[PDB]
Amino acid sequence: HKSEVAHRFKDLGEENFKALVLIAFAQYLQQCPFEDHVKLVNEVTEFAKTCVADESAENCDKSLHTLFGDKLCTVATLRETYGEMADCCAKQEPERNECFLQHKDDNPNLPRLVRPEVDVMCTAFHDNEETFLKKYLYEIARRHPYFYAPELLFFAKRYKAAFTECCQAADKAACLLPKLDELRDEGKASSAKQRLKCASLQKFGERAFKAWAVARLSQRFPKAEFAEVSKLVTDLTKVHTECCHGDLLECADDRADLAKYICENQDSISSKLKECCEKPLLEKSHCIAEVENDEMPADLPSLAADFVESKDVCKNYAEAKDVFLGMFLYEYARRHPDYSVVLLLRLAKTYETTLEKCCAAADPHECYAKVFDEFKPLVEEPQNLIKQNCELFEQLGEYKFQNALLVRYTKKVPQVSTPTLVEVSRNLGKVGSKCCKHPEAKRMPCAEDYLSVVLNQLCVLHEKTPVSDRVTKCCTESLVNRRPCFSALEVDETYVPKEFNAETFTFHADICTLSEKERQIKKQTALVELVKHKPKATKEQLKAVMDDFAAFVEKCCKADDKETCFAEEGKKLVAASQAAL
Ligand SMILES: CCCCCCCCCCCCCCCC(=O)O
Ligand SMILES: CCCCCCCCCCCCCCCC(=O)O
Ligand SMILES: CCCCCCCCCCCCCCCC(=O)O
């Protein structure tokens, strides 16, 4: 291991090496032009090949942090452009690297990347495929400087595949656009999870993180024994703690180490791990992190033996409370992959609460019996919600299902901005489409995955621009009570109806040309504004108003003249509607 850079180049391969180096530099120097970074990438790459030919080369023996930091400090416009960051160059390793980490800018001021015309895109992709993909990789990287590089590289390769298909199919846009949208969604969903995962570690501490980890690791690896799960959870915590810190190389090494260990003890962890461990170093950790749940042992007893009916229960628990609780959590989770992780956490927490209560009683054995009865109401809470909502999603379209939620959440929290209500409602709708297609056995984990990001996304926007105490109570409580807290929201009896505005309910003929997506958005925007103006409207009354509107649109988008119909019958619709409500 004379040369760190030489070893990295051999493991990743020139192409991946280049791509990752571009991402790294793009994540630090986020305000330097693309051609600058390209020059860097080629300089580092050529040097690396020098080191590959001969590890004893002149600078080959240096550290990757040292080499990276030196390159950063050779940027001529560094001080001018980045000010303080240029001061880091006086610090010495390893203090320097930390200094660079400190002055990494999160979400700087840049204009939103606008998706160009399909013809233009495919044409660029054909003429210069490499400078086309890398330019966009650079653009994504600079705007998401804390996103894990190998993960950003993982999406890049998927983008490249998308164009390869569609850019030579007659109806390109019909192919490409629904693929780019999927990527956009997944990319931001992945990014959200990461910030969230890291934020929770900081917010609630290592313990809660370990509890979360124990549940999911037990679910995924139900054939694994607790001692093994403990070591994995222990290491996973170590990894998340370092990765959350932000050092790419340190984070990468810890990840690689865990994947290394997991793949070598495959037989002792999971049977569905063979293909993941076969993949290259770069993809190992990724693969393991979302591997399929292993199938659990047929001969599995009930927990009641070791956790309820047994003697030595307070003694075993008091001897190591968190260990014993983790065992309960492990034992329970591996039997129920059909549960959300947070559900298992409510149960383990419930088990904990009673032991703290009953072990202090004269005879604990009775208060244990109470425990499992308490589990059932907590378990059915999320189960019922899923049944009903997926039924609702079945009867009504995804669009009409979104509108159902729309009215519901507008009446629960009317103070929220209209655009926010429309967005969260459309997204919860999408969750319905994706999860309700699963059977019950897999529905709850599915919902938890999407609601987690949607609910924390929701809480982030509220952080910046608070609008309700009840929403801030939900956003700032335990991430296990979060979703139930939102579900506990009732209709706001406080809300004063917002004053009428004819403009808000004034529609022109342009909506007849609008795309299917934003005709809906404009309609849904008005639906929120309707519910806000008269929040005490019944479902029948609201349906009536919406029906008249719907026919009103089809009557004006069907006429020889249009803009007059929208202004004349529009006047009629608004008047009649104000009267009914
Ligand atoms: C391998 C051992 C890991 C430790 C297991 C800890 C189990 C804790 C049980 C209660 C759920 C923890 C949820 C955190 C929320 C809280 O701080 O109350
Ligand atoms: C002089 C070096 C310049 C900087 C080098 C950029 C960082 C390249 C290392 C990234 C490799 C990631 C390792 C695999 C990822 C994983 O297993 O999780
Ligand atoms: C910035 C403020 C945003 C507030 C958004 C108000 C709408 C809340 C949506 C709650 C989603 C959680 C769904 C749980 C299932 C349920 O409805 O009971």
Structural domain spans, the chain: 3-105, 106-195, 203-294, 295-380, 381-492, 493-572
Look at residues 575, 417, 410, 414 and name the one whose alpha carbon lies nearest to residue 502.
Answer: 575
Let me know: does 186 contact 450? Beta carbons within 8 Å.
Answer: no
Q: Tell me the CATH class for 295-380.
A: mainly alpha
Residue 548 identity: D
**Contacts (Cβ under 8 Å, ≥6 apart) of 390:** 432, 435, 436, 443
Question: What is d(CA 402, CA 543) in angstroms, rounded to the nearest whole number?
Answer: 14
Q: Is 11 annotated as a binding residue?
A: yes
CA dihedral over 386, 388, 389, 395, signed as positive or negative: positive
According to CATH, what is the number of the domain 493-572?
Answer: 1.10.246.10
SS3 content of the chain, % helix, strand, coil (to 5): 75, 0, 25
Q: Is the CB of 346 under 6 A from ligand 1?
A: no
**Contacts (Cβ under 8 Å, ≥6 apart) of 242:** 250, 251, 254
The CA angle 153-159-160, to the nearest 5 degrees, is: 90
Question: What is d(CA 475, CA 114) in angstroms, rounded to the nearest whole number?
Answer: 31
Write out the H or E segment, with its range, that includes residue 455: helix 440-464
What atom in ligand 3 is closest to the CA of residue 459? 1
The runs of H, that is alpha helices, within 359-439 are: 365-395, 398-412, 418-435
> What CATH topology corresponds to 106-195?
Serum Albumin; Chain A, Domain 1 (1.10.246)
Q: Is 65 annotated as a binding residue?
A: yes
Q: Is the CB of 491 under 6 A from ligand 3?
A: no
Q: How far is CA 517 from the centre of its chain?
A: 23
Peptide bond just before 94 cis, omega within 30 deg: yes
Who lines ligand 2 at CB under 6 A?
Answer: 5, 8, 12, 20-21, 24, 44, 64, 67-68, 150, 248, 252, 255-256, 281-282, 284-285
Phi then psi for 185, rounded to 5 degrees? -60, -50
Let me know: does 346 contact 480? Beta carbons within 8 Å.
Answer: yes
Question: What is d(CA 165, CA 155) in angstroms, rounded to the nearest whole number?
Answer: 16
Any idea what DSSP says for residue 364?
T
Look at residues 126, 152, 129 and name the one whose alpha carbon lies nearest to residue 139.
Answer: 152
Return the ligand number nearest the Cα of 233. 1
111: left (phi over 0), alpha (psi -120 to 50) or beta: beta
Question: What is d(CA 244, CA 430) in angstroms, rounded to the nearest whole number?
Answer: 30
In the chain, breaks (C-N over 2.5 A) are found after none
Instruction: Record the resolution, in angstroms.
Output: 2.8
Look at residues 280, 222, 231, 288 and name the one whose alpha carbon lies nearest to residue 255.
Answer: 288
> What CATH topology corresponds to 3-105?
Serum Albumin; Chain A, Domain 1 (1.10.246)
Q: How far apart are the first and last CA of the chain?
A: 77
Same fold, 381-492 and 493-572: yes
Mutating to test ligand 2, I would choose from 3, 4, 8, 254 the residue with most ligand atoms within 8 A of its C-beta, which is 8
Q: Is 4 annotated as a binding residue?
A: yes
Measured in Å, residue 377 CA sits from the centre of ligand 2 at 48
Structure tokens at 249: 């190389």
Q: Which residue has the tokens 């305000």?
A: 31
What atom in ligand 2 is closest to the CA of residue 251? 18
Domain 381-492 has CATH 3.30.1330.10: no
Question: What is d(CA 324, CA 466) in angstroms, rounded to the nearest whole number?
Answer: 40
Domain 203-294 has CATH 1.10.246.10: yes
Return the ligand number nearest the Cα of 249. 2
Return the ligand number nearest the Cα of 423. 3
